[PDB]
Amino acid sequence: FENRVAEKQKLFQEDNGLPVHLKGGATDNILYRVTMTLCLGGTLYSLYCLGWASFPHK
Amino acid sequence: MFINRWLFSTNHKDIGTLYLLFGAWAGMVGTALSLLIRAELGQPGTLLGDDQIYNVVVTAHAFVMIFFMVMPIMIGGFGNWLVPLMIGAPDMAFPRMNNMSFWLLPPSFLLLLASSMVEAGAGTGWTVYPPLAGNLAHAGASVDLTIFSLHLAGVSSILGAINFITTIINMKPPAMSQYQTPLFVWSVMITAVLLLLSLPVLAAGITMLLTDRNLNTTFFDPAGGGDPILYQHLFWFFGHPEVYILILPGFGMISHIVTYYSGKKEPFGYMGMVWAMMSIGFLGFIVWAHHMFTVGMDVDTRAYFTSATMIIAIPTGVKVFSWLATLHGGNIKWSPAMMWALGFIFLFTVGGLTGIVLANSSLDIVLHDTYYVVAHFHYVLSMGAVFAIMGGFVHWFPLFSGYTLNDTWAKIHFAIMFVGVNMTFFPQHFLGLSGMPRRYSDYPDAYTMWNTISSMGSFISLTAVMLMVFIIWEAFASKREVLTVDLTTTNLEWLNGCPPPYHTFEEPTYVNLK
Amino acid sequence: HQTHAYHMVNPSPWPLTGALSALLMTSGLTMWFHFNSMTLLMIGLTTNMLTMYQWWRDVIRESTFQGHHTPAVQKGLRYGMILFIISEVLFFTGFFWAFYHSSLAPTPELGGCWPPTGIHPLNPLEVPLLNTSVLLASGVSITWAHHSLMEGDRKHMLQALFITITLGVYFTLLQASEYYEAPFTISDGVYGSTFFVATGFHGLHVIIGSTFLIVCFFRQLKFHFTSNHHFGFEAAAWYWHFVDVVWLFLYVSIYWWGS
Amino acid sequence: KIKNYQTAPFDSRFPNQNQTRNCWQNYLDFHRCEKAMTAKGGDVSVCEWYRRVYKSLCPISWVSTWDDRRAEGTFPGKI
Amino acid sequence: KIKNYQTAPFDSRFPNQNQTRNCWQNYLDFHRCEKAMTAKGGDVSVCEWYRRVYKSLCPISWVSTWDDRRAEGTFPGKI
Amino acid sequence: ASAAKGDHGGTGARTWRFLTFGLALPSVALCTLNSWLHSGHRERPAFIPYHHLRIRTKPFSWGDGNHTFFHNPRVNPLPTGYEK
Amino acid sequence: HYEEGPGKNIPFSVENKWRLLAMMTLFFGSGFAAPFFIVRHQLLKK
Amino acid sequence: MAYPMQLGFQDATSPIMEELLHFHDHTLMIVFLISSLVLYIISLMLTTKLTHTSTMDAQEVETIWTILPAIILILIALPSLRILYMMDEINNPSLTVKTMGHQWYWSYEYTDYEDLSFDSYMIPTSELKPGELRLLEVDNRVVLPMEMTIRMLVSSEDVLHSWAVPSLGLKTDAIPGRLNQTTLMSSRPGLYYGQCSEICGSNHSFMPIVLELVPLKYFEKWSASML
Numbered sequence A: 001f002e003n004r005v006a007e008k009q010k011l012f013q014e015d016n017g018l019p020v021h022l023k024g025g026a027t028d029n030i031l032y033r034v035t036m037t038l039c040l041g042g043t044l045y046s047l048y049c050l051g052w053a054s055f056p057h058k
Numbered sequence B: 001m002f003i004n005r006w007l008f009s010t011n012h013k014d015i016g017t018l019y020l021l022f023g024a025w026a027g028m029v030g031t032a033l034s035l036l037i038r039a040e041l042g043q044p045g046t047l048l049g050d051d052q053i054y055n056v057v058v059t060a061h062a063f064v065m066i067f068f069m070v071m072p073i074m075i076g077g078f079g080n081w082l083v084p085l086m087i088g089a090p091d092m093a094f095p096r097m098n099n100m101s102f103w104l105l106p107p108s109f110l111l112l113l114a115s116s117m118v119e120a121g122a123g124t125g126w127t128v129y130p131p132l133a134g135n136l137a138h139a140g141a142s143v144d145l146t147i148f149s150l151h152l153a154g155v156s157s158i159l160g161a162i163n164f165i166t167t168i169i170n171m172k173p174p175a176m177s178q179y180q181t182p183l184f185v186w187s188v189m190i191t192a193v194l195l196l197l198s199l200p201v202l203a204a205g206i207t208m209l210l211t212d213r214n215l216n217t218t219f220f221d222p223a224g225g226g227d228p229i230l231y232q233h234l235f236w237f238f239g240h241p242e243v244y245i246l247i248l249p250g251f252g253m254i255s256h257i258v259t260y261y262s263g264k265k266e267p268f269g270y271m272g273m274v275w276a277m278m279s280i281g282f283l284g285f286i287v288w289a290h291h292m293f294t295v296g297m298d299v300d301t302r303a304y305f306t307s308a309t310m311i312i313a314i315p316t317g318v319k320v321f322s323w324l325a326t327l328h329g330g331n332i333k334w335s336p337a338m339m340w341a342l343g344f345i346f347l348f349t350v351g352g353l354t355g356i357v358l359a360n361s362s363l364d365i366v367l368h369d370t371y372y373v374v375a376h377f378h379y380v381l382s383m384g385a386v387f388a389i390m391g392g393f394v395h396w397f398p399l400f401s402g403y404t405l406n407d408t409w410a411k412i413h414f415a416i417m418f419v420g421v422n423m424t425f426f427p428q429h430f431l432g433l434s435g436m437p438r439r440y441s442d443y444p445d446a447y448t449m450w451n452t453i454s455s456m457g458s459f460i461s462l463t464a465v466m467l468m469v470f471i472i473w474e475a476f477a478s479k480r481e482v483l484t485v486d487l488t489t490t491n492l493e494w495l496n497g498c499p500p501p502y503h504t505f506e507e508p509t510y511v512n513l514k
Numbered sequence C: 001h002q003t004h005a006y007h008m009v010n011p012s013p014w015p016l017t018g019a020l021s022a023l024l025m026t027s028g029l030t031m032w033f034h035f036n037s038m039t040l041l042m043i044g045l046t047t048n049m050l051t052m053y054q055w056w057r058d059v060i061r062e063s064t065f066q067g068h069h070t071p072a073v074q075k076g077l078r079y080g081m082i083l084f085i086i087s088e089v090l091f092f093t094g095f096f097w098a099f100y101h102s103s104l105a106p107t108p109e110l111g112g113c114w115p116p117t118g119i120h121p122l123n124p125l126e127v128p129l130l131n132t133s134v135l136l137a138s139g140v141s142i143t144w145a146h147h148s149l150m151e152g153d154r155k156h157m158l159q160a161l162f163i164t165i166t167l168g169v170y171f172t173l174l175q176a177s178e179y180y181e182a183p184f185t186i187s188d189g190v191y192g193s194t195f196f197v198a199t200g201f202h203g204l205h206v207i208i209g210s211t212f213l214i215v216c217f218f219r220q221l222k223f224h225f226t227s228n229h230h231f232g233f234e235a236a237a238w239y240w241h242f243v244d245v246v247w248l249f250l251y252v253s254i255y256w257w258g259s
Numbered sequence D, E: 001k002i003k004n005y006q007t008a009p010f011d012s013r014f015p016n017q018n019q020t021r022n023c024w025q026n027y028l029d030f031h032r033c034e035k036a037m038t039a040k041g042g043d044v045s046v047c048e049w050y051r052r053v054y055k056s057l058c059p060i061s062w063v064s065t066w067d068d069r070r071a072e073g074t075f076p077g078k079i
Numbered sequence F: 001a002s003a004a005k006g007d008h009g010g011t012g013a014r015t016w017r018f019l020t021f022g023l024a025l026p027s028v029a030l031c032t033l034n035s036w037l038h039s040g041h042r043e044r045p046a047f048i049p050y051h052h053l054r055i056r057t058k059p060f061s062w063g064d065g066n067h068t069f070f071h072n073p074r075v076n077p078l079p080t081g082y083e084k
Numbered sequence G: 001h002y003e004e005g006p007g008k009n010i011p012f013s014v015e016n017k018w019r020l021l022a023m024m025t026l027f028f029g030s031g032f033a034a035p036f037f038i039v040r041h042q043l044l045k046k
Numbered sequence H: 001m002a003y004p005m006q007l008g009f010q011d012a013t014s015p016i017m018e019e020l021l022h023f024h025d026h027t028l029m030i031v032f033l034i035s036s037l038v039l040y041i042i043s044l045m046l047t048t049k050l051t052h053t054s055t056m057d058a059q060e061v062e063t064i065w066t067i068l069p070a071i072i073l074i075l076i077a078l079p080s081l082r083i084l085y086m087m088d089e090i091n092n093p094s095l096t097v098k099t100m101g102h103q104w105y106w107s108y109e110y111t112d113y114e115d116l117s118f119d120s121y122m123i124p125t126s127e128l129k130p131g132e133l134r135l136l137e138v139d140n141r142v143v144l145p146m147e148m149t150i151r152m153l154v155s156s157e158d159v160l161h162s163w164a165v166p167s168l169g170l171k172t173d174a175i176p177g178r179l180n181q182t183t184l185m186s187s188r189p190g191l192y193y194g195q196c197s198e199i200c201g202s203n204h205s206f207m208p209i210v211l212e213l214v215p216l217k218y219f220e221k222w223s224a225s226m227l
């Protein structure tokens, strides 16, 4: 292996106004969207489950 | 921009605001629950149903008032808002982790609401003692949702504790020693240390209850060689420190309020105040068994716990007399905040004194699990903790919002609340001495008068809570912008104006070492 | 421009995704324990992993790549890690308290003795002793790794760290095997309860600790650490020693004294 | 014979509020003695005292459960 | 009766080279049993096994010293 | 204690490596020798349905609800006894 | 960057005092009402 | 029992409860004195136009407000611990009675000589005989001999309960798998009431305790006839 930290330092210090969690590139965007979708979707699903468990199925 | 600011925040002020909002909402829920309790006891007979629905209400009332109202407001709200400003720090040490401590609360609250929605709820008492809380006497998801709620609230507070301790130790100006930080900052750090040490024990204990309920372990089940009393020790080892966690930030705010409205530049006996809070924090870890005087412990163990418990009155006494000594010779400003602080000093003292009565294991035999205990803790919590929160809220509202409240309306609010809480809880001493048990949906006929008067007092308090919402509305509706504040030389949090800008102390304060 | 040395962190979505993942995992456990379904739990575990991955990735970006970790910031992180470890110690203390409470006053249901009637404890001189030498040995190799890094020796740092990780994995495999071989289970009264919950949470910490060390190994491979700035490695090592010390207490209390 | 028992007297071995062991101990003692006497060709009347004490102190359901278990072969105590 | 004893059999409680407690335990057991029987009105013949075992294992001088001490009131063991 | 070795003139990388290969790993090799020697499957004890063991207050959330997570047929009996 | 100053450092708007009263009413009212409706829920199940 | 508008403790039925009443009067006086002293001082501090806002020294007045409370705490602890040890005194009972808590009733066992045992349920309000107390009466009372030292053993067969009789100064938790002991000794004949004192579910408020204290003679007859 070779030391490429300098390249990474350049990339992450590039003045493009992007927040650190998206400054790596397009992949950050994708991973973020996947994460948030699973979180919000899963939360909606948990709400539905609560609605189901709240009522007796005799 | 709205989402980035309010959902992705890394700002101590905004995060403190979120906490204040959450705690205010929680307070409405907890008040409603307390009204249901007092409605049920307002006249002899059954109103809602048996002890199950009643105790599901009692249990939730406690969890909401403690975990969702008091702690979030004092520590997350006032703590986040004021701590960085009082030490001239640009923000908290871990600004992102700070945001997670907040966001764990809504899910935690949702689990608590879910537990009361499913099955027959968790009617176990906030202490959640097995076997009643076990899988046979409380089968179904309710108790499990309650345990998970506590786990989330626990992680939130532990991370919050790590953040506060680190910020307070590491981010003061280079020249400022720990003995140069305001008393509120000291109160928050000590509270954070108690949280860091106590919550993990609670977490261990409730995890064991969880496994006993779902994985066939038998930590508290005698059939497997377990012991229900083990749970009590684990719970109360966290439980007592918890009550000091609920009052310490209150003591800190009271010191600031009393000093401020006495026109003083400093509280009387600063080092004695630091000593007192540290002593209280320490003693608070070696007295837990006073919540177990009737479980059948050896007499020597009971003599020790009686003795150790009473010692806390000494450091607490130093604080009380120091607050009085701060008023001494002051140019007293009779503002609404001052009123709340004066009520706190007297009412907390009364509650603390009945605590000393309860410390005696001999007497506690007869007072335990009776309304005398309920009277004791409502004086220190519903009058102590709550008055400190109200005082701090009216005092700092102009700083947080940039607007002033109507002082006359605020004084009317204080008067109503004062009558309400005293009418609600004072008669409960009588009910306790005469033998009325805790967690009862109905009582023998002889207890009718005092229960009737107590329930009427609770309605007076409801009137005060409704008025407070109106008062906050009126302030935001009229928009009277703050101009100047007195005593900024000894109250750094006000020095950046009202409200301070999003980023404060970008250029740190200058403090000579000499 | 700020004229203080502290880190003003960019607004981040991870605190929220992390909190939501906690809701999904607890909701998930409830669904599994009571409504026989692992769907919620699976989603929770996934978003949790994603949150941690991205959050820590960003911390690396902020420090190694952007230079936000000034001495003041690093000092704070040191306090943070020590405090976290303290809370973990207290968590285990609750389990030791449960162990001693049960073992020191065996109830009649157990036969009034410890270990309970019908319980045949593992021999502490067999795999449990091996596990002990494995963790103590990894404590020595990680110290060699630390000194190599400070002395600017890349090859030996990687070598020592690899050995440390192999040892942690070895312990994990040994424990997994011991769990399978054990004649007693978690449902075997308070003996099985205390044994499996305490060693189980410890095993979980060993897995977390090993993962932390693996992260360090790859950050080292990528030249992230300088001979003087490598807090991630220091934290991983402090955490590793903690895991080591908890084992020593478990070994002496549960495996040896409690047999 | 040396009896005329009212109730189980104070036992310095179990001087505290938790009396669980006192009950257990006497139950064990009676069944151990009863087994020794029934074995070596003797009389169970010597085991009388223990029987009276455990009968006095032990909850009926405890004695009943323990008896069922000794019969089933699952009594965890040593007899 | 149930005897026909050659010598003290292996005892899983004392499986090692040091047999000091084996002797001591059986000596105590015999004298405890002997006291229980002579007390509650029974027969010492039930205590026979313990007597045979301790007599087989215990050095004569030990038994002799212990006996002298029980008589003198200085026996440190509990009987 | 002070062990029975010596160095201390300066504890560095070379010293810790020396300890890793000269003391630590050899200890692990010995314990591995000892363990993979005293192993051998021990004869499973007779089953006795003790009430304080094989606890079942609620079925497990997996399998048939009656088997423990790391159930070993060879040594873990069910509440009703060993398996076929 | 974000808005600063009185009425701008909050997640709700105070531009119109009546719209605000509606907000606060729903906010605090929903909290106070929740326990009553959960009690109703529990009574209507059995 | 408690009567309408009661302010303090139910009248003492045992020597120990009498002891507690005097200890509470002693403690309450201190509580009243300190709380009113604090209220007075607050009013004193707030009623003067005179001021002194400069730095005030504290290492002098803190000796006073550290030593005084310390002395006061000792003055409370002394009689408190005297009573505590007194309750632990060896007394040697003439009778042993056991009570088992159950999900919503108490069962009693008098097994010293005969194997006597019965359940004790609350009399429903709809079935109370005229003049009977709502929520407090039970079908089978705990008949006990007056002026005699009795050993009560308490346990439970399900969840936690707590056996209490305020007039006698008693409260002993009923824990499953544990046998808690307390001693009872009534100075007078009569009926003495108490209520379950540990949350146990649905009918926690409805499982009272009623002791019937009568002379030895009557106790004996009752014994026999309850076979």
Ligand SMILES: CCCCCCCCCCCCCCCCCC(=O)OCC(COC(=O)CCCCCCCCCCCCCCCCC)OC(=O)CCCCCCCCCCCCCCCCC
Binding pocket: B006, B013, B017, B018, B020, B021, B022, B023, B024, B025, B106, B109, B110, B113, B397, B400, B401, B472, B499, G009, G010, G011, G012, G013, G023, G024, G026, G027, G030, G034
């Ligand atoms: C639940 C929320 C109710 C929703 C009602 C809102 C409707 C909006 C329509 C929407 C119409 C759009 C109009 C836009 C502008 C303003 C409205 C706003 O944006 O809408 C939302 C905003 C604003 O909030 C409001 O809307 C009005 C609040 C007024 C508060 C005055 C407080 C005065 C006290 C002083 C506070 C300290 C700050 C002062 C100092 C100044 C700060 C420095 O809030 C937030 O986004 C963050 C709040 C987070 C947490 C608070 C408690 C949450 C508890 C949840 C747990 C549930 C468990 C399951 C429980 C499930 C139930 C069974």
Ligand SMILES: CCCCCCCCCCCCCCCCCC(=O)OCC(COC(=O)CCCCCCCCCCCCCCCCC)OC(=O)CCCCCCCCCCCCCCCCC
Binding pocket: B350, B354, B422, B423, B426, B427, B429, B430, B433, B453, H007, H008, H009, H028, H031, H032, H035, H036, H039
């Ligand atoms: C609303 C309830 C109505 C009840 C009225 C009583 C009826 C009397 C029948 C009149 C009938 C007379 C015949 C009965 C005599 C039997 C004596 C006894 O065996 O019974 C013994 C009982 C009863 O005690 C008494 O011997 C009466 C004491 C009454 C104290 C009343 C204070 C009232 C303050 C004003 C409103 C309360 C809120 C203030 C809070 C005060 C802090 C506790 O002992 C207790 O355990 C009760 C109180 C316990 C703990 C609180 C201690 C702190 C006191 C603070 C003092 C502040 C003073 C400044 C002045 C306070 C300024 C605010």
Ligand code: HEA
Binding pocket: B127, B243, B244, B246, B247, B290, B291, B309, B310, B312, B313, B314, B316, B317, B318, B320, B348, B349, B350, B351, B352, B353, B355, B356, B358, B359, B360, B364, B367, B368, B369, B373, B376, B377, B380, B381, B384, B385, H034, H038, H068, H069, H070, H072, H073
């Ligand atoms: C804000 C919360 C808070 C605080 C600060 C306290 C403070 C104290 N508490 Fe209280 N307590 C609770 C909340 C609190 N408590 C709760 C919630 C419960 C019930 C839990 C449950 O079961 O659900 C409870 C229960 C409880 C019990 C258990 C009773 C029982 O269940 O039978 C006991 C036992 O000793 C006790 C004692 C004390 C004491 C001695 C103090 C001391 O810290 C008070 C010290 C203060 C003073 C004494 C006053 C000021 C001092 C002076 C003016 C100096 C001079 C004084 C003297 C010389 C005496 N408390």
Ligand code: HEA
Binding pocket: B020, B023, B024, B026, B027, B028, B030, B031, B034, B035, B037, B038, B058, B059, B061, B062, B063, B065, B066, B069, B070, B073, B124, B125, B126, B127, B374, B378, B381, B382, B385, B386, B389, B390, B393, B421, B424, B437, B438, B439, B440, B441, B458, B461, B462, B465
């Ligand atoms: C902080 C804790 C707290 C608070 C404030 C209160 C307040 C009240 N509680 Fe209490 N209560 C408990 C904690 C608390 N309680 C606990 C721990 C238990 C025991 C549970 C158990 O047994 O398991 C209990 C039990 C309990 C019982 C006994 C139940 C039983 O044994 O059967 C009763 C009975 O009357 C009662 C009544 C009330 C009433 C009428 C109020 C009223 O005074 C409430 C009035 C309204 C307020 C004081 C809230 C105002 C604050 C806000 C709304 C925030 C405002 C916003 C900002 C300033 C930003 N409570």
Ligand SMILES: CCCCC/C=C\C/C=C\C/C=C\C/C=C\CCCC(=O)O[C@H](COC(=O)CCCCCCCCCCCCCCCCC)COP(=O)(O)OCCN
Binding pocket: B165, B193, C075, C078, C079, C082, C083, C085, C089, C092, C093, C096, C238, C241, C242, C243, C245, C246, C249
């Ligand atoms: C039955 C038993 C149950 C199970 C037991 C299980 C496990 C056993 C326990 C522990 C073993 C585990 C791991 C140990 C290995 C490493 C830990 C890390 C310590 C370390 O290596 O830290 C360093 C040493 O400093 C230092 O101790 C600095 C000090 C720390 C500062 C933070 C603490 C602040 C909290 C407040 C403390 C209050 C004390 C104040 C005094 C009054 C109190 C009465 C560097 O750090 P730093 O922050 O820059 O400090 C600057 C000071 N030089």
Ligand SMILES: CCCCC/C=C\C/C=C\C/C=C\C/C=C\CCCC(=O)O[C@H](COC(=O)CCCCCCCCCCCCCCCCC)COP(=O)(O)OCCN
Binding pocket: B151, B152, B154, B155, B203, B207, B210, B211, B215, C172, C175, C176, C179, C180, C181, C182, C183, C184, C185, C186, C187, C196, C197, C199, C200, C201, C203, C204, F068, F069, F070, F071, F072, F076
């Ligand atoms: C291989 C060594 C490493 C140990 C961990 C590895 C795999 C198990 C999965 C998760 C474990 C994580 C923490 C421990 C929680 C419970 C104890 C588990 C320890 C363990 O694995 O114990 C096993 C039981 O498994 C069981 O029930 C397991 C059932 C799985 C259920 C998980 C339930 C999760 C409960 C989590 C509660 C978490 C709350 C955490 C709070 C943290 C602070 C807020 C023992 O097997 P057995 O067949 O009974 O006996 C062996 C007989 N041959």
Ligand SMILES: CCCCC/C=C/C/C=C\CCCCCCCC(=O)O[C@H](COC(=O)CCCCCCCCCCCCCCC)COP(=O)(O)OCC[N+](C)(C)C
Binding pocket: B321, B324, B325, B328, H041, H055, H056, H057, H058, H061, H064, H065, H068, H069
């Ligand atoms: C349950 C147990 C508790 C019960 C009771 C406890 C109450 C204590 C009662 C009395 C305390 C007596 C303190 C004596 C201090 C003298 C006060 C004084 O006068 O205050 C100053 C001293 O500074 C100083 O100690 C600092 C100023 C005053 C120091 C003390 C003031 C605080 C007193 C307490 C306040 C009331 C709260 C009491 C709590 C119960 C004045 O300074 P000088 O004269 O040098 O300068 C002035 C210039 N000359 C020289 C020209 C006159």
Ligand SMILES: CCCCCC/C=C\CCCCCCCCCC(=O)O[C@H](COC(=O)CCCCCCCCCCCCCCC)COP(=O)(O)OC[C@@H](O)CO
Binding pocket: B093, B094, B095, B096, B097, B098, B151, B152, B155, B158, B162, B200, B203, C007, C009, C018, C019, C021, C022, C025, C026, C048, C051, C052, C055, C058, C059, C062, C063, C068, C073, C077, C080, C081, C084, C087, C088, C091
């Ligand atoms: C299923 C049953 C219950 C489940 C509950 C689960 C709850 C949450 C799950 C999701 C949390 C995972 C996401 C990662 C969190 C990492 C936080 C962290 O790593 O926080 C760090 C600080 O705390 C530090 O170091 C010191 C401490 C590091 C803290 C590590 C966080 C672990 C969270 C679990 C805590 C359990 C408590 C343990 C006690 C029993 C970094 O601070 P930031 O503010 O980010 O940045 C500051 C910048 O200057 C950095 O460049």
Ligand SMILES: CCCCCC/C=C\CCCCCCCCCC(=O)O[C@H](COC(=O)CCCCCCCCCCCCCCC)COP(=O)(O)OC[C@@H](O)CO
Binding pocket: B298, C089, C090, C093, C097, C098, C100, C101, C102, C104, C105, D016, D018, D021
């Ligand atoms: C260390 C501080 C200074 C020491 C001063 C004393 C304070 C704590 C001491 C800690 C060690 C004590 C152990 C001695 C054991 C003697 C008591 C014993 O034997 O108690 C046993 C349980 O002890 C148990 O788990 C005891 C288990 C722990 C309970 C104590 C709680 C403190 C633990 C948390 C502290 C956090 C510190 C972090 C550590 C790194 C069993 O219960 P008994 O009541 O006996 O029941 C017998 C009945 O059948 C008859 O009545």
Ligand SMILES: CCCCCC/C=C\CCCCCCCCCC(=O)O[C@H](COC(=O)CCCCCCCCCCCCCCC)COP(=O)(O)OC[C@@H](O)CO
Binding pocket: C056, C057, C059, C060, C063, C064, C069, C077, C207, C208, C209, C211, C212, C215, C224, C225, C226, C229, C230, C231, C232, C233, C235
């Ligand atoms: C398959 C198993 C999955 C199990 C789930 C848990 C999985 C993994 C946990 C392991 C976490 C690894 C943490 C990775 C941290 C990477 C970020 C890091 O290490 O970041 C460092 C900061 O430390 C920091 O925030 C320190 C960050 C502290 C994090 C440690 C917290 C441990 C988490 C425990 C959570 C569970 C709690 C237990 C349950 C009861 C960055 O600073 P440096 O290193 O100085 O670099 C700078 C130099 O390059 C300059 O030249």
Ligand SMILES: C[C@H](CCC(=O)O)[C@H]1CC[C@@H]2[C@H]3[C@H](O)C[C@@H]4C[C@@H](O)CC[C@]4(C)[C@@H]3C[C@@H](O)[C@@]21C
Binding pocket: A001, A002, C154, C155, C156, C158, C159, C162, C221
């Ligand atoms: C490639 C690298 C040399 C430095 C560089 O990257 O330039 C070498 C040096 C030391 C490392 C090795 C260490 O000797 C430790 C390990 C020993 C081997 O048995 C397997 C791989 C092993 C895990 C490592 C892989 C190897 O590729 C490393 C990473």
Ligand SMILES: C[C@H](CCC(=O)O)[C@H]1CC[C@H]2[C@@H]3[C@H](O)C[C@@H]4C[C@H](O)CC[C@]4(C)[C@H]3C[C@H](O)[C@]12C
Binding pocket: B271, B272, B275, B318, H059, H060, H062, H063, H064, H066
């Ligand atoms: C020494 C320390 C700090 C002094 C300073 O550096 O300013 C001071 C602060 C608070 C003081 C304590 C508090 O005033 C309470 C106690 C008061 C008594 O007068 C002596 C002991 C007493 C326990 C004090 C001892 C010591 O003087 C303390 C502990």
Ligand code: CUA
Binding pocket: H101, H102, H104, H160, H161, H162, H196, H197, H198, H199, H200, H201, H203, H204, H205, H207
């Ligand atoms: Cu039985 Cu409450």
Ligand SMILES: [Cu+2]
Binding pocket: B239, B240, B243, B287, B288, B290, B291
């Ligand atoms: Cu306490």
Ligand SMILES: [Mg+2]
Binding pocket: B294, B368, B369, H162, H197, H198
């Ligand atoms: Mg109780």
Ligand code: NA
Binding pocket: B040, B041, B042, B043, B044, B045, B046, B047, B441, B442, B443
């Ligand atoms: Na009612």
